[PDB]
Amino acid sequence: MAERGYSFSLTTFSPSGKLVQIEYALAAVAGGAPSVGIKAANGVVLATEKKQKSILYDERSVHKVEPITKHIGLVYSGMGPDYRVLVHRARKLAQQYYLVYQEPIPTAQLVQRVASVMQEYTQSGGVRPFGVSLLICGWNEGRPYLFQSDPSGAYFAWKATAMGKNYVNGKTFLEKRYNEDLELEDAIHTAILTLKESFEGQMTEDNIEVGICNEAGFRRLTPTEVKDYLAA
Amino acid sequence: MALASVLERPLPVNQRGFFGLGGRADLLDLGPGSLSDGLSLAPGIEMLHGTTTLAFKFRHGVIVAADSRTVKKVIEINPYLLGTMAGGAADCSFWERLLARQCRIYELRNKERISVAAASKLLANMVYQYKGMGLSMGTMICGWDKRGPGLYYVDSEGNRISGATFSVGSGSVYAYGVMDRGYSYDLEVEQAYDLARRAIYQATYRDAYSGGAVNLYHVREDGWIRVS
Amino acid sequence: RYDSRTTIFSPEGRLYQVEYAMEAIGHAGTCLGILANDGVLLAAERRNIHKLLDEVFFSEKIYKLNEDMACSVAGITSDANVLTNELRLIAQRYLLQYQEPIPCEQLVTALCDIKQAYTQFGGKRPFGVSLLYIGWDKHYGFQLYQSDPSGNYGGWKATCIGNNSAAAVSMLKQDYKEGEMTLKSALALAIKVLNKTMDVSKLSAEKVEIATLTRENGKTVIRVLKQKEVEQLIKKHEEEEAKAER
Amino acid sequence: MFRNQYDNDVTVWSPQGRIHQIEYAMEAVKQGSATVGLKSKTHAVLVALKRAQSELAAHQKKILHVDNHIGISIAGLTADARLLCNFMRQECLDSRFVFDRPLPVSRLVSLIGSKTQIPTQRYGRRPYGVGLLIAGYDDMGPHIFQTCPSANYFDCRAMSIGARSQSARTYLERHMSEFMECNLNELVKHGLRALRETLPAEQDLTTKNVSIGIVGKDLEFTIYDDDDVSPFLEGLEER
Amino acid sequence: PVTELSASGPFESHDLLRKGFSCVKNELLPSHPLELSEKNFQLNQDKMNFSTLRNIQGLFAPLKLQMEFKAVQQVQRLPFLSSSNLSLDVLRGNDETIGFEDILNDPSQSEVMGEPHLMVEYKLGLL
Amino acid sequence: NHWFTYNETMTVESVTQAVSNLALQFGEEDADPGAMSRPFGVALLFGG
Amino acid sequence: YNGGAVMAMKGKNCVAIAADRRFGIQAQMVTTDFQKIFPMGDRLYIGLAGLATDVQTVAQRLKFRLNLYELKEGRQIKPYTLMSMVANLLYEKRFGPYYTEPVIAGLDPKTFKPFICSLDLIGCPMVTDDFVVSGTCAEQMYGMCESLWEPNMDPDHLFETISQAMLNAVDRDAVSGMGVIVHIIEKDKITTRTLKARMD
Amino acid sequence: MEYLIGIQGPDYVLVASDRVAASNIVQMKDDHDKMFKMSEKILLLCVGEAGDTVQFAEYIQKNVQLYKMRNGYELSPTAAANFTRRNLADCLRSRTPYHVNLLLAGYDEHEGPALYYMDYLAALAKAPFAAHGYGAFLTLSILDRYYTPTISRERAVELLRKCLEELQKRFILNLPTFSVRIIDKNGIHDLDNISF
Amino acid sequence: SYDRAITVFSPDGHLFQVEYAQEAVKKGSTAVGVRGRDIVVLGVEKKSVAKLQDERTVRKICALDDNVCMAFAGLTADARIVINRARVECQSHRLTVEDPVTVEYITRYIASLKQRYTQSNGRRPFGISALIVGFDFDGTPRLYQTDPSGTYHAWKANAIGRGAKSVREFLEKNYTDEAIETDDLTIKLVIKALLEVVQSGGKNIELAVMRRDQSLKILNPEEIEKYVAEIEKEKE
Amino acid sequence: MAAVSVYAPPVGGFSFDNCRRNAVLEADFAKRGYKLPKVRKTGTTIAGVVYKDGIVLGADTNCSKIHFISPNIYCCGAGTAADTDMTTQLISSNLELHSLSTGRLPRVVTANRMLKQMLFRYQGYIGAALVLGGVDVTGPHLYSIYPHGSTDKLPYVTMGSGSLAAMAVFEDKFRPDMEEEEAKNLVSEAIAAGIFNNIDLCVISKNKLDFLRPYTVPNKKGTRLTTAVLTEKITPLE
Q: Which residues contact A61 (CB under 8 A, 6 or more apart)?
């Protein structure tokens, strides 16, 4: 599959205008672990599937659902190291915004700055795109936000979405069950169900990760809280 | 070695002789009598100084005249361009040697001679770059180009004045006076006035140090001449 | 001789990578700009029309750059974000230095110099973005420019970029009346063209965003039409097409 | 045949463990014209064959002056020889400036070795295509050094480099047992006979095609050319 | 009194309209004690780190750090557009600290930027 | 430059040597940017 | 040289910002009569007392940053955020400051709650809920503002009080050619009045 | 010992400047033009140091002309005033003591006349009348006493003569010949030198 | 041994990438420049005009200073870059030496910029050729031409672009001293040369003249049509 | 716009323009009595002690001189007001980044290092003299950082105008391992002895602070707390 070398360079358009090395970076996202974001009427839900699924993992060590500030939180599907490098950058950008304006960064502003970093990585040559698509959940101005930034650096505002493996079926599932008036609790139920759609066997509180964002701010649910949600 | 070379710093650690926040650093600063001679681009308190000069434009040229003689009071920039001295001797000589270098490079490139406006402007730029650093120039660029006779006063303080009568020095006040002239003086009558004016300086002195005749000059159309 | 770099001419003088960059827009949504006697407009097709997409910033495609200018991109979206940010920066830098709003063609020229720099130095992908600018300045009045990935701009009285730009341009060239355009007739023509060139679906005031620029009492008014007005324009067009049929 | 992927760059090791651009640079040395260096107990002479297209041109300047005690004879690319000669001259100046004494020949040659080793490891470079015969005189006596495109240097009793220099080296190996007690005249004659051995049986050494450079205990480095070589060539028996 | 007039050879040429207002008269004594300490701070910090690496570990350590810095700084954005220095910060260790260079006088909104081609070919050493 | 520094005319061979120092500096592009990166495609004939 | 004097007071759902004007003056040297109060928004103003050149530079750079912020965020700036932007700029000098000292006086475009502030030349803000003063006459300006300010004023009482404080502060028995310009920001309108002491 | 002065009328701007370039280490005729033509309808009057003023005004002139060449139209008097203010601010901070006092006069078809004062610290102020140099306060007091917005070109010239003669009264000095120029919808016009 | 690299000679000794940039020049609209006695004229064909276009924005004749002018053929974006650099250089030269650029000085600068871009195979040459007309400071009319390689020459009349060969043949056969006596004859000779490649003439022709001591003046379509009508009358 | 005079991209940080201009201008104005604007100072008594399981930090008041750096670390400042504000804000955001990566609540030594190295970098030209104090897994730590970049780890410390009276009170009545009330009263008493010719109090206690739960971002709120006329003109808007 080497279209005259249009396939191997990041800075070469194909004769049809495609950039078929940024869509191969979108195939790294669509081969990552499933993620779900559901923007309820009073909060956002970020549920993902953990790759650290065996008993030998310290679960106070490394997490896939991360906070950026008190009110913004991320999940990803794709390549984990790229996520970590972008997460530390997003945290720095949020703190620079606070230091300048004395106000927490809005979700849209953070998404824009992170997407500009990703875009930079898709244009030089001698470098490689990011293999992660992020979901950013935030709460500003009494209004939830759910965004998605893909490896190309093009972000989208969503009501509900699904990433990672089996995300077309996940989005089809979400379309049939999302309604705007959904409350955050029913959103958590729906997000766990959408993960349960494309999941490799029995789902425990220790092989999925959930993080919510409401008025009180972004918070990652503890394994007991996820256990309680799964039991219902 | 190849890695430090691929890096192209050069910084005093990726070298040889580094033993702290610096050390010998490839020769403890010791180097060579230059790496490049000249022929390429690359505490002494007793500098020398000057005294009295005229210059007027004309109908037939521009006429420099200086307080006799020894010492030098008029720099001979090139066959078609003249200049006087005031202030530091080294300053005037060096910066107008650089100007003559520029004028000759211009003539070689463009196949026509530089104009007086351009030459005086180049000099004014060169000495304006180091304004306030103690350069002492009082030159007075005169020549003849496609626009006719040219006369400019260029200074180390950034001044560059065009004019048809200039005078620098001690007898300047008496020499600018006595400059009762006309743009249509005959050549002999012009030599007359410049002689008389340097004289009305020295009607209170006589031949000696910065004393002698008048070191007269004359910038014709085909280059200057020395009248006497 | 070949098309692997932007810094290589084919043996007939063609820069093939720039031509491929310009081929990316023909996929993007149809952006349309029309110049009238009393205003300018930008009609843009809402490409992202999925069910679960959120209600977003005041416009997906239309961006404000000044008090006096707006743009409407078509092509790669991330490059477009970078370019609109730099447009706003360029305009504020002109205002800072001269204390006057930037004239429209000077902004277009500056951005197109940026785009050309990316088509000239090797190891840098050109911007797959074609922009469409509308504005007002004290020199030339209402202006409408276009720009393409090669950094190559031009001023128009009606132009289209994006999907089906050629059919739209043929229709505008047939129906745009030079000198006798008002903003209402320009809006009617915009709906008509943007209808006949969006024939993948039936036109509705949820797949189009329209922004008009006018001058009211000495200030420019960039206004993005509300969803309840674009419906009225679409009804006016449908009733007109019913009358013109029988 | 299996060699094409591994010989286009000096940064590629061939699966036999060989850099091939280094060997091709050594060939570039062989493409010059023969020059000979030999030393006695008191003198170090450099003899070179000049080509001038055989008519209408001043011959190549094949023996160059580096310092009062160092001179070099070149074979190979001329641009590289000039770059290396500029380096040698600058290093000799630096030694005289900082330390007031003539730079030792061995130290200079070591510096050349490092300088010419860097291109044979780095990207975007090529080895130096010139080989030198450095004749020096310092506190340790006469010296003859041979530098290579591979960045190797050798301490020689005598050496010939260039095109068809194997014949000169055969002569020098045959006759090196008597070089040390030779005086200047017959040492230069020995070098001349070796250089002649690098020629067809018909051609003979003339003043037009022979350049000589002597350094020694009393001499500073002097180059003899085009009419100054006549005292040395007059006494050279036929072949 | 700085000496150094290369004046042996003060033949250098400048672009008058682009040099702006340069005053070599006062370009020998910084305007503030902190002017150069802040201008060259990442430079001096790199030099301090390379010096300690050299003195403790060897030539290889600064060489590898400089080689990584050179590599990441080269897949970048053309100089007339602001870059993020994401990989360079991860290498230098500034991915989790905010200094005053980060919040004051933001480079992303410069208030002044030159021509694209002039800034690119100045970075290339062409003037 | 030679006239400025030494107050005399540069000889023919010295001019040719300076031009040669400029002309032999190709390849090695990432060492002194503004260098040439290929041989000059011109032969000169200095006659003086 | 006289830097000037800029003042701000709070009323009930209304703010006032005032500065002196110098009606009659034929002074010389550095500029004296400059523009001090700049609209930074629909209901947001900044007063800038100090060196005239630095007042203009600060106003222009502030408008640069504010225009960029409002385009990127698509929202009208808030008074406290303007305070923080002004502080960030002033402090990015800090070693060589701008000789200007601002006051922000505006209305928040959500609840139209008054906000007043005053920074120094390197940007240390002081947010009070009664009045601020900024200039070379801060001592008697403060005394007069303390003596006259009453809580929960209305637009007319606000105008009267701020005019009295400015006039009787710059007084020095020298209100001759001394003017006062007063902007009264309210939820509905902005009323600018330029006034003189009756003595003249 | 420099003098600048400007009077703006309903459709014209009248400026005057003395012709002395003393620089008294050299003897020369006055002849000195302190007004630089930035464009077809803009004048920059500059007084201050020797050499530092001509260089600054020429830099500004080249940048104004470059704007015209690139853009096809000219900078307005206000945009040229603000560009000058920014550049004088940049030059005043690069170049230690740098006293360049400016007075920009101009005309715009869609803005009318425009006079701009600018002190040695680069604080631009649009003014109806202005003056720099010696006795500036006294000229300003006279102008303020007598300047009316609808003043005529002839009356403005006569008021200018009043200012100069009344400065000659208060200060017993030479008062050299003053270049006088006017800017109206037809460009810069030279008027007769005020000489006394 | 091929093209595809800017700095690689072919075994015949050809740098083909520069020659392909000149191929890029040979596709642009024809630009004709004629040097007269006291007027210098420039004319470019308006190839495939679109009715819904502001023609002010797609002009190919530009003023570099008050005495120098320039028309180009090739890629228009490269031309915009080169033109604006030339404008800055004209003003900078005036700042350096006070004198207006001679037309050769700015031709040399433009060629040096193009020649900088023909080095370093990490850069791309400018695919434009320019016709720089003007008047020197002493009043001599000039006409120069640069090409992508960095090579410039002085001409009496010239054509660049597509159909430059036919127009240059016409100019050689028709440029005499009797075609230059008046300003009008120079203008009509440029229009006649352009009518050799332009179909439906007059509306596809962009004239701009520059008389001595005067600025560039673009001729509006009315004046151009009057000149074309005069030409057809002179055809009889 | 593309300025012609720009070759290299601008950078960020402190500006150092106006430096020579301000030097000449301040020398000129001081020779005429013109009173350029000055910076605000916050010289007031700030004091702190370490009791058995925490620290108490105190200050004078109408303002708020006790800054927030971490849920477990707090700071008082004397010197230039803007300098203490900006210094503590920058170190607070750095410690937020540090804690948010590590998942641990910060250490007082980390804050001390950041402060002292930042204050050393700006060679005493940032006038922030601070009384840092907090509580980590290691225990209560009290520091006093000085504007030139020198710290001092102490059991009790005082700064400001009444520092000598308060230091005398501390040397009189400080004992290792006091109770929260005893230490609170001692800090208040030292401040009061330093003011007489209200008092803020920050109490960070070890048993009000969990160092085993993962760190989560705290929520923040904010700070900073006749004659007749003749109206010549009026102009309502909107």
A: none
